[PDB]
Amino acid sequence: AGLLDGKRILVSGIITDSSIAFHIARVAQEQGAQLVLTGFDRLRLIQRITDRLPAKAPLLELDVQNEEHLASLAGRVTEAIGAGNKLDGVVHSIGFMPQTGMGINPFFDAPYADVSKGIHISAYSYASMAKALLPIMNPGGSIVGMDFDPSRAMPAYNWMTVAKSALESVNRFVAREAGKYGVRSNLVAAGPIRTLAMSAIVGGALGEEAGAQIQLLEEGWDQRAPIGWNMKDATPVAKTVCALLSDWLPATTGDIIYADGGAHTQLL
Amino acid sequence: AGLLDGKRILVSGIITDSSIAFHIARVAQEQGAQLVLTGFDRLRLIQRITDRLPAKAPLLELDVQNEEHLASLAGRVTEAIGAGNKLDGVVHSIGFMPQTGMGINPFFDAPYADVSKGIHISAYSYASMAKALLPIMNPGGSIVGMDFDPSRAMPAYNWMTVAKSALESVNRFVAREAGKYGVRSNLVAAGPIRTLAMSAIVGGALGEEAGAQIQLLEEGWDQRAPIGWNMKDATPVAKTVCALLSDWLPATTGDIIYADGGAHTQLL
Amino acid sequence: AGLLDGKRILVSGIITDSSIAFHIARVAQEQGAQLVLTGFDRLRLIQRITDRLPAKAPLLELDVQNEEHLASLAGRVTEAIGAGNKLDGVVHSIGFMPQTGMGINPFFDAPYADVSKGIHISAYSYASMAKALLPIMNPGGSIVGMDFDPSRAMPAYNWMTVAKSALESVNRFVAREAGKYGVRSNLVAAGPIRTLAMSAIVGGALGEEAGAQIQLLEEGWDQRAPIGWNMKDATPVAKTVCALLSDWLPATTGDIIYADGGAHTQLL
Amino acid sequence: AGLLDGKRILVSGIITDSSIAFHIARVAQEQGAQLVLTGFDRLRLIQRITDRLPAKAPLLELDVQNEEHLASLAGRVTEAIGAGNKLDGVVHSIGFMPQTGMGINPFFDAPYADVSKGIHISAYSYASMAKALLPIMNPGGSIVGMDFDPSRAMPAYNWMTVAKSALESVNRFVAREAGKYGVRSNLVAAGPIRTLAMSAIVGGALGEEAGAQIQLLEEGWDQRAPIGWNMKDATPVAKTVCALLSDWLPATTGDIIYADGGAHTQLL
Numbered sequence A, B, C, D: 001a002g003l004l005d006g007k008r009i010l011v012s013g014i015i016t017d018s019s020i021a022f023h024i025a026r027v028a029q030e031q032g033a034q035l036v037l038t039g040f041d042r043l044r045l046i047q048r049i050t051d052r053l054p055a056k057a058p059l060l061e062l063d064v065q066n067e068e069h070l071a072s073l074a075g076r077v078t079e080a081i082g083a084g085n086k087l088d089g090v091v092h093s094i095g096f097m098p099q100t101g102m103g104i105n106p107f108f109d110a111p112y113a114d115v116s117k118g119i120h121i122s123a124y125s126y127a128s129m130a131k132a133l134l135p136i137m138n139p140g141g142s143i144v145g146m147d148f149d150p151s152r153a154m155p156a157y158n159w160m161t162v163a164k165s166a167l168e169s170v171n172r173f174v175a176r177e178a179g180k181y182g183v184r185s186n187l188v189a190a191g192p193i194r195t196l197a198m199s200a201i202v203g204g205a206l207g208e209e210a211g212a213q214i215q216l217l218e219e220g221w222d223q224r225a226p227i228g229w230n231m232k233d234a235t236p237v238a239k240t241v242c243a244l245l246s247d248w249l250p251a252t253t254g255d256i257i258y259a260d261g262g263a264h265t266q267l268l
């Protein structure tokens, strides 16, 4: 009986209990939505992590680089929610860039094969998922993806940043197609969140310099954000995604909503 | 028991039953909010128009250019909602520019006294209202103002456009102050809506050329908007404002949410 | 025989030998341009300061808030460059905001009369000058104004920032009119330069907090700028203005060129 | 004795006498620069086309997707300009996207292998070229690439647009590295130019719908541009690139200069 009461939503991107996607799924269910999850390759793990969600939800395997996974995607989803039913929302919360495209490894030293894999998973997959799922979405539906403001360069993030720039551009095009189905397509630019991977990197997983740079980046965030920013709490981001999945933002598409504490609206 | 259940919200800007503000108030009340309205100078009229709202709400006079109105504002609002209570939201939906700053009258022919009056009411008042109301707002509160994308020049709108550019900049600063009170400050950029004034202008109220230019502007909107745009329906805009007044966009401030059908994300 | 060889250019904004305008005039003359200067109210001083320029140039009084000054402006300029001749360029390098609109004085405490005076001189005057001068400009001409990136809020600058937001918007409209005369209109966003006033402020002229905030702002600039930034050297900015006055940027108008060392293209 | 007198500049991208690059090379030489050209795979043709340039210039083969070409690039360039000498400028004017990523072929039907090839040549190569050439560039040097505003979606261009979004982001990062060598990195966003390929497409080479869409896009350009736009004349674009290669835009890097007639600063 909440924001998403009666909505059927597919949520990808869960890998650990610290994933933004995990918190997206929790808030969504708390708000009355029925979910259908998708996981990359460690499904046994994802399954075990997802049992902790408020309610149960079927888990479907989905390797965004696998054409067969995508081709059969809509089929398996309908099977999970039952024939005759369609999705009202889709959450894209996946991203990746080989170590070579981030951290201390110099920007120029990233081989195209690695950058291409990063863009395939981080940006193109947004279009892939929409393509596979639009056929089984209801008018008024909503697709949303996770993003971070790449309008300016920054240290460490390197090619992952370039992948976001590409993603934002793909979103604007996905909106054109999604509009034919009465569906909206938007992105959510979050502030930095301490997921497992992020912590590992801050801890020096990808080099000391990278870790040091990303650390004072997080610190400058809470300082710039007029309402502050708590990197250990992904709830404010999960709510924003749910706001976009609801019926309360019916006139916005091909857009980006910033859930970063307002940090990007301030020089300092 | 809706989006704004239990929220006390002040809504300015109602002048006719076609005002964006009127539709903001309606949706807000339908969602369980208690309102406190403010009107410019024709209160008898505003009063008569507002009786048509779902529920009743006290109407307070407020001339945004009157220092006394603003000085006593918070006092009269507390009186209306009762001592001990505070506002959880504030909607700024006022705007104005003398005929000389819009339409066929050439851009260069607008005397500064007129432009200054337009900016005083359309942009500075956003800061004025926040100043007067922040002292009586609850943490988690939300201030929202009506806006239109002025990132690019356009015919007819002339100085009103310049006033919006100023407004967007004031919003970013209001967010800095509002943040000290745990309050967010955002703007909503709407697509063109056929209010009384807009219709009059399209009908040639400010010259034939102006009317003709604004008319094909509205037409290009629905064409560019991936989800289309209905200029006669302000409901999609009212909902977006309510989304910002709710607790579902807790990490965004000093920002702009586009409720324009996605028209600004497309070249054509 | 340089960049502006044979060009007649009017340059406003000189007040001391540290003014951006002073350096604009110097580089322009070094590049073969004939100038016509305008000064605010201390002409004896301006005159004495300008004698130091490479070559001599007539000085005309111009109070941007004085309608008579503007009305007779074109007349006096033609007299100075001789009947039959027209200007090929115009440099707007003036700006002002009462103490109340900047520094430690809280944002909300700036009375509209002060903000309005600041916007009149800092933004509207851009339109005023174009209006008066376009009638006496040659096709291929170029108008340029001084600006600073106000796309994000920042401490201390307060309303002066809002005035720039307005200026950028006015520039886009001035371009529409200037285009009818075959003339371009652009702005140059400079990094912080240590003019007399800026130094005074950094020294605490408008409060200690303001001075401290602006000081670490300048420091963060050179750090973010991929090519660095030297606040004591206005030459890089003067050259950029001359680039816009030349014939080498013939397809850009209603635009903004950033001469800030590239600081705005980087988060850090 | 012109803008680039004494400058050694490498210019890639020439394929026909209608290529933007061809006009870049012409204006550059007319302004006193010594060039070193690079061509893709039809060197016999490029050679024959380039004989028509004002002066002669060595042509080096360069397949941006060939690691060997890039690895030996700097070596062959030094050989061409003679040991002891370095480049003062580099022009990246290459772009490509398989038919499947543009035109009538639906956005969702573009296989990643094709999109990846387009991004490799259109965006990543900007970084590749900088990497290979920075070691042999002089302080004060300048790298510039051709671009088109992809901030908004548009019909027909599809993935090529996404590739530009990526390119703009890569440019901001290239600037960080180039800055270490005292070198600037900028992009030039041009209005539509009737190159051979563009004409072919307008003529229906990639489908009738695509051709029709791109045709009214070009038409809307001249209408929006305050100074107009001539799609058959690439000279205004060539000059802008030369402006960036000169010493008159010393404080701008990681940026984008719009040589589009000012079309992007206007809604209509």
Ligand SMILES: CCc1cc(C(=O)[C@H]2C=CN([C@@H]3O[C@H](COP(=O)(O)OP(=O)(O)OC[C@H]4O[C@@H](n5cnc6c(N)ncnc65)[C@H](O)[C@@H]4O)[C@@H](O)[C@H]3O)C=C2C(N)=O)ccn1
Pocket: A012, A013, A014, A015, A016, A018, A019, A020, A021, A039, A040, A041, A062, A063, A064, A065, A092, A093, A094, A095, A096, A121, A146, A147, A148, A149, A154, A157, A189, A190, A191, A192, A193, A194, A195, A196, A197, A198, A217, C267
């Ligand atoms: C200064 C620069 C900056 C950076 C940020 C951020 O990085 C911030 C913004 C977006 N995001 C995005 O949020 C999404 C989820 O990431 P999380 O942080 O939750 O991390 P997780 O690693 O927990 O989860 C995401 C998913 O990646 C998935 N994976 C990889 N390849 C595939 C594939 N091929 N198919 C299917 N799944 C795959 C994986 O299985 C996993 O479930 C991504 O799109 C992110 O980029 C995360 C942020 C953070 N801080 O952790 C914010 C502000 N400024």
Ligand SMILES: CCc1cc(C(=O)[C@H]2C=CN([C@@H]3O[C@H](COP(=O)(O)OP(=O)(O)OC[C@H]4O[C@@H](n5cnc6c(N)ncnc65)[C@H](O)[C@@H]4O)[C@@H](O)[C@H]3O)C=C2C(N)=O)ccn1
Pocket: B012, B013, B014, B015, B016, B018, B019, B020, B021, B039, B040, B041, B062, B063, B064, B065, B092, B093, B094, B095, B096, B121, B146, B147, B148, B149, B154, B157, B189, B190, B191, B192, B193, B194, B195, B196, B197, B198, B217, D267
């Ligand atoms: C191509 C350019 C463009 C324009 C738009 C728009 O103009 C669109 C966007 C914002 N708005 C904003 O919405 C707000 C409300 O305007 P409405 O359209 O409802 O019109 P209304 O005239 O109905 O209502 C607004 C209020 O102005 C108030 N008024 C004037 N002076 C004062 C004062 N001094 N003190 C108190 N009240 C005063 C007046 O009393 C009235 O209630 C304003 O801030 C508008 O600019 C309206 C739009 C429209 N189409 O009608 C959208 C996209 N592109």
Ligand SMILES: CCc1cc(C(=O)[C@H]2C=CN([C@@H]3O[C@H](COP(=O)(O)OP(=O)(O)OC[C@H]4O[C@@H](n5cnc6c(N)ncnc65)[C@H](O)[C@@H]4O)[C@@H](O)[C@H]3O)C=C2C(N)=O)ccn1
Pocket: A267, C012, C013, C014, C015, C016, C018, C019, C020, C021, C039, C040, C041, C062, C063, C064, C065, C092, C093, C094, C095, C096, C121, C146, C147, C148, C149, C154, C157, C189, C190, C191, C192, C193, C194, C195, C196, C197, C198, C217
């Ligand atoms: C973090 C915020 C920020 C700020 C900046 C800047 O402030 C920077 C950018 C633009 N500018 C602009 O450059 C122009 C010239 O300012 P200067 O710095 O040279 O200062 P000056 O005070 O030397 O000169 C400008 C003129 O103001 C003129 N004046 C006032 N009123 C009038 C009037 N009514 N009629 C005629 N003249 C009048 C006055 O006579 C004087 O000649 C203005 O438009 C400025 O805002 C200056 C900067 C600086 N650092 O000094 C850059 C980056 N980030």
Ligand SMILES: CCc1cc(C(=O)[C@H]2C=CN([C@@H]3O[C@H](COP(=O)(O)OP(=O)(O)OC[C@H]4O[C@@H](n5cnc6c(N)ncnc65)[C@H](O)[C@@H]4O)[C@@H](O)[C@H]3O)C=C2C(N)=O)ccn1
Pocket: B267, D012, D013, D014, D015, D016, D018, D019, D020, D021, D039, D040, D041, D062, D063, D064, D065, D092, D093, D094, D095, D096, D121, D146, D147, D148, D149, D154, D157, D189, D190, D191, D192, D193, D194, D195, D196, D197, D198, D217
């Ligand atoms: C509404 C959308 C839109 C589009 C535009 C434009 O497309 C406009 C903007 C940039 N450009 C860019 O200008 C550059 C040059 O393109 P031209 O138009 O001259 O076309 P050309 O085809 O003449 O030349 C470019 C080069 O591509 C080169 N090529 C392909 N692969 C490789 C490779 N692997 N290695 C080396 N060379 C290769 C090829 O050899 C050729 O010399 C590119 O980066 C373009 O995208 C061209 C425009 C136009 N109208 O022709 C402008 C505004 N709005």
